Amino acid sequence: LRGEKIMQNDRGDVIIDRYLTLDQEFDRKDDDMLLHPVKKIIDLDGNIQDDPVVRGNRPDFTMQPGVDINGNSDGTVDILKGMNRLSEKMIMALKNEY
């Protein structure tokens, strides 16, 4: 929750870890709580879908999320999304019923 990369070596606590998978479900429920159509002025999705048949050269590894030797994600994008979600939730909470 602090936006820190989890270390496998760290023992943690047995009781609280049971809620880790539940949080993975709350984040999904929160991603939809924030998702909504975006104005075309700053819609970055339409720029990549402007020409759906673009086939060029795949970008270098410096222009892609980091991966490990085995090929799976290193996990730094998750904390980037976590802070992104924290800011989005704070701003959305401002526009409450009051």
Which residues would be at the binding site for another protein (CB under 8 A)? 3-5, 34-35, 38-58, 60-71, 76-77, 79-81, 83-84, 87-88, 90-91, 94
- Rounded to whole angstroms, how far apart are CA atoms 89 and 93? 6
Smallest gap from residue 15 Cβ to another protein (A): 26
Smallest gap from residue 39 Cβ to another protein (A): 8
Q: Are 65 and 73 in contact (CB under 8 A)?
A: yes
Closest CA to 82 of 16, 13, 24, 8: 24
Nearer to another protein, 4 or 10 (CB): 4
Residues 6+ apart with CB under 8 A from 68: 74
Nearer to another protein, 20 or 34 (CB): 34
Nearer to another protein, 14 or 68 (CB): 68
Smallest gap from residue 10 Cβ to another protein (A): 14
Structural tokens at position 66:
């980091």
Q: Which residue is listed with tokens 């159509």?
A: 37
